[PDB]
Design a protein around this nucleic acid. Structure first.
Ligand SMILES: Nc1ncnc2c1ncn2[C@@H]1O[C@H](COP(=O)(O)OP(=O)(O)NP(=O)(O)O)[C@@H](O)[C@H]1O
Ligand SMILES: Nc1ncnc2c1ncn2[C@@H]1O[C@H](COP(=O)(O)OP(=O)(O)NP(=O)(O)O)[C@@H](O)[C@H]1O
Lengths: 486, 486, 234, 113, 113
DNA sequence: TTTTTTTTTTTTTTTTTTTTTTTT
DNA sequence: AAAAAAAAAAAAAAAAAAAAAAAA
């Protein structure tokens, strides 16, 4: 008859869910009705589309035009619906052969002259389009942003007539500019630029291999955030897909990285108090927060007890599943937050100790595997200049990569994410080691999860020593990283 | 078919984003349609533009008119969209040759007689136009404000007919007037009025010469606030590019400053009664706050134990990044906030003194580099008159001008902004210096931050002696200004 | 639809969720033409893809004294107060309890399915017919443990509908929170109200609580924090 | 609209010690002059001065020197004349109780009287 | 509305000893009747009075003589008639601490027994 | 060895800007 | 073809419940 289908994508949450644009024409008096929860920025696109179609020397149909943006449950805020609506209107009036619109997705604004203009936060659309294996058409102003993915099967155009020519006559035009240069870390910082703490350094290196969260205990003014800020150095380079996902997460916020930190794990340490709306998801049109940010990186947490209780209890979901499920009353949208957690805590500024320690949430203070006490540096070490022992981060990075490969070989998850049931099956335990653990529980009444936490850290230490299975010395070193002190 | 394009500037935050006005005429019913998120202040430009065009002996088209305002996602708030729309309507109707609108930007509010009216906050638009090398035409009422920049590519007009004549026959309009007939610095304020406080004045001298933040403590009624106020004169006069930015922020607020002091570094002390939105950011269309009003200047926080922590917890990020980002749920807005901190407090209002200090935010005091005490002024020295007329002023300002260049030659930041690693290799601590530093460290209870705080101010004092490295004499003086006692 | 005994016609895209109930009398369609053909002539639409362990009491040694008491509590539906010295948690006794209870019927399991479905991201694998066991964390939160806030979401107690609640170290908890757990025990549902209106989360379950009476003269203090009505219904 | 009665006698306004900061100084809404501005060119009396909250008393310093209070309603700011003359009455307390009582005063404001 | 009840017969209500101030009289949200507002024309059983909150027992003043507990949310005044009869029970309690025990009995309410 | 006040958070209210539905 | 009665949110202001902070 006189209806057509075109496919777009709208950035809701972090994932660009597919949006079906449906255009129908009927023999009524001329009109234009937009159906679907479209905001003003989209409802105003009627005149833009009419002018773009007319000024490109096409015939704008003088009939009842009905446009539906399915599905109808999701509000649509992106302004880049003009190009698909125009193509749908053209296809409905049989000015474009319909069979070529099946495998394409279109995103882009339209000025009244027919020239395309770019839209913001486009990278997630490209990611979704490739994931579904769909050709994507993009306004040429977005080629600079979209080329960072380096993804094929993405084309750009300048005018609506260019897109029409591509669809009908097949005169393919433009392609993503070539990928930018794959330069190197420019990482400065380095782990070498920290004076000798030794115990804290070794503990952090152990946890980086095992991906375990740590508590940075000790007196304030001792080097808590200073040591943490260098922890992201140890973590390995992210994969192509992981880097692309982090890039989309940052792109939705609006601050494009500088083409270099692409493969560097993020840090994004949140403020002291901040806001629970800001630090987890958001309201209005929902935007990612500090939790959603630093998806595959390391998240820092200074002055853990000070944080609001509701924030800490809502923080249970990520370390348990890696998703946030903030609801918008009508529905819910997911946020990926599978992050490494680093926390700092100061053992009180003796009556107040009970309430101060009790103020800290235990649901958070159960998955914090390791703890360490960061003693202040001796004046001799503070005043002594650093020999710098040449830069030392690539050796530790190589060690972490090898340990991660070893862990990936024996199961499909890291030791931090091991289930309680699989801990016994995976680990190779000797009889004397089991007897030693039984004797240890005589000395200290560790909880049920203490077993698995001690086993988890000792597994990384044992794999660190040379190979094979757990040993008495490994558990002996592990015992030092108990849950608390007092 | 004919349509016209016309460029203008709409200001959001501080920078004036480019906005392209598109006008298209169709053969439908005579209606006027405007799209592009028009705030109702500009949405009613239809009747104003219609009457302005009719009354200037032109011919208003009797056709359907569609007007599109730039990017479809940027709200338009200014009232100065009448002139671009009127010129677009004229150009689309072939009453103006289109080629002349190639590289011009128009800003101006029209009246029904055709006379142009001044629009508030014109300076950022002029700056943006000069950055892009574009002719800018404004109302005659804005000539006084636009003359600050002194750019030669800005023209002014009296009515729409003048603009049409300029675009059609090159009548050449009326250029903006020359720089105001004033050069005399004066400022009626200088360092001499502070009498008797030799030690604190000498310390504030080195505070200006290294960009260090300085904390002041002393008895009320002495020159604390006066020394803060006179501290502006010490800093070197701002460059033209910095003066334009400061004038842009000031004009955006609305307080047009006096031409006499448009190059002095701004000084603005916030008031204790202020919302966290008053100092930083703003509601509505975002407006610069108190902190950004002191860009490239000095911020004076008198009575530091006041200013409820809710206010001070927002000042953290600007002290490190030099800017603050405010989210409008649809875009991100940035405000320049690079400044120098000066704070004043009463040392004493028993163990209650600790509670008095407890209200202070430790991380804020972490960034402060210097502390001095305002001792009670001697009897006869104040009792003795001020017959001395040896006003220092220009001498110390000349000294700090060279001082900033000397620091800028070594690294890419002043002594206050040194990285911890860069504290060394710039201060070649000798054999005896380490000995003395070890002694003072052992006898005191300094932290890691305090040691590096001690090094930077000592570096600045070392430059004051035109010596390559510290000579154990600068360290002794540094201890006095250091020792952030409380 | 099941409660009223009514046929459902549902979009084919929703067959992923409606199949998880394993229901009959629920159909799926693609077009209005298919539904019109069904109503006019009955063209036999699709009817969802039908759907086809844990520990036991054997893992515990011959503790006949407590085992038979627990069985009686399960048979009679009464609560229980497994408590004493905190010996290695002792929660392994409670974890076995959920296995003893009878298998839930269609509506009973389906109601828990809906209650979980509200929280979004429907539980991952399987096992809807097994009654839940979800237990608190000895500190919880008044919003999280009971009812909720913001646009309402079921609390921990409601999630344990037709299941078991293992509230450990009862004395510590919160005095205000404990009394909020009153209406569900008596009626079987909560009526938490806030702002505009309220909704009724069904909260029928069974309670298993633990306590420590300390090693002197501190037993009275350790029991002084107890809520009388909550213990009176045990 | 006082007319013919006191249009040449200096105003005398004595706000009650609680009042409200949005009425004592400036205000919201399309702004209406507050208590402080109502005493322009006149006398302002503050009985039981320490009883006033420190937040309000710290605002008194700006008009006492600059001569006019500058309201700060985020987007907009307006000027109100405040050239008044200040008169204050305080009770020298009814141990550390003396220090606690005198802490409720504003040291700069009292030391500027 | 639960069951078929009896309606024609006097009601009986007994608060949950510790109870709550919002449950005994009035309530939040749109005005909801309190426990004391219940048992209208009936019998209210107040068991173990000292366990109750002192302020609420003081708030029982008007209901037992006036029969109306009109709530005040600063927006509306809903009446909620509460005519009833009081019945209370006391434990003599386990001697100078007897005064401490009796100090919580809310003597103004004890006068109406 | 025994009891209270205050500040913060949350909740509500109010105003205004936004929205959403008249009435030509 | 321009408007005005109604549903939602952002910010300022005031009151109730909790925490703790400090006082006997
Ligand atoms: N182990 C350390 N090694 C080298 N430098 C350190 C070390 N600890 C502190 N520093 C110095 O500490 C200064 C800033 O780091 P730091 O004091 O840790 O800030 P912070 O992490 O925000 N607060 P805190 O951790 O409590 O001290 C730098 O000059 C560092 O050089
Ligand atoms: N050498 C001097 N030392 C101190 N005060 C001086 C000196 N010379 C003049 N003064 C005068 O004394 C006034 C003191 O100002 P100041 O004490 O800073 O008032 P303020 O703004 O309330 N800050 P504060 O110091 O806390 O009282 C100055 O405004 C000068 O008018």
């Amino acid at each position: 008859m006189s209806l057509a289908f075109t496919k777009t994508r709208s950035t809701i949450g972090i994932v660009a869910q597919p949006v079906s644009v449906e255009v129908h024409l009927s023999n009524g008096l001329p009109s234009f009705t937009m159906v679907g929860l479209a905001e003003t920025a989209v409802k105003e696109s009627k005149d833009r589309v009419r002018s773009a179609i007319i000024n490109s020397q096409f015939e704008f149909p003088c009939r009842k035009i009905t446009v539906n943006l399915g599905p109808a449950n999701l509000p649509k805020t992106g302004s880049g619906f003009d190009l698909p609506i125009a193509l749908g209107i053209l296809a409905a009036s049989e000015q474009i052969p319909l069979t070529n619109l099946a495998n394409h997705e279109f995103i882009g604004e339209l000025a009244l002259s027919g020239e395309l203009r770019g839209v913001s936060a486009i990278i997630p659309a490209v990611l979704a389009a490739h994931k579904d294996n769909q050709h994507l058409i993009i306004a040429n102003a977005n080629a600079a942003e979209a080329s960072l993915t380096g993804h094929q099967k993405v084309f750009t155009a300048n005018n609506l007539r260019e897109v029409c020519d591509y669809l009908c006559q097949g005169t393919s035009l433009q392609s993503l500019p070539p990928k930018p240069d794959l330069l190197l870390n420019n990482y400065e910082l380095d782990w070498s630029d920290i004076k000798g703490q030794q115990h804290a350094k070794n503990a952090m290196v152990i946890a980086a291999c095992g991906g375990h969260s740590i508590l940075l205990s000790g007196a304030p003014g001792s080097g808590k955030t200073m040591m943490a800020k260098r922890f992201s150095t140890l973590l390995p380079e992210l994969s192509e897909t992981q880097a692309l996902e982090c890039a989309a997460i940052n792109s939705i916020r609006g601050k494009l990285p500088d083409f270099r930190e692409w493969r560097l794990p993020p840090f994004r340490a949140p403020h002291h108090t901040a806001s629970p709306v800001a630090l987890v998801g958001g309201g209005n049109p929902p935007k990612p927060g500090e939790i959603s940010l630093a998806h595959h990186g390391v998240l820092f947490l200074d002055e853990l007890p000070e944080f609001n209780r509701q924030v800490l209890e809502t923080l249970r979901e990520p370390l348990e599943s890696g998703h946030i499920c903030i609801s918008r009353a009508a529905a819910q949208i997911e946020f990926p937050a599978k992050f490494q957690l680093i926390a700092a805590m100061n053992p009180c500024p003796p009556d107040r100790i009970s309430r101060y320690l009790a103020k800290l949430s235990a649901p958070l203070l159960d998955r914090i595997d390791m703890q360490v006490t960061i003693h202040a540096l001796s004046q001799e070490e503070l005043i002594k200049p650093n020999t710098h022992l040449e830069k030392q981060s690539l050796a530790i990075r190589e060690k972490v990569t090898k340990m991660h490969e070893i862990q990936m070989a024996r199961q499909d998850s890291l030791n931090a994410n091991l289930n309680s049931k699989t801990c016994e099956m995976v680990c190779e335990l000797g009889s004397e080691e089991q007897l030693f653990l039984r004797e240890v529980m005589s000395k200290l009444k560790l909880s049920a999860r203490g077993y698995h936490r001690l086993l988890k850290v000792s597994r990384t230490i044992a794999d660190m020593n040379s190979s094979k299975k757990v040993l008495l010395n490994h558990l002996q070193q592990a015992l030092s990283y108990k849950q608390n002190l007092h």
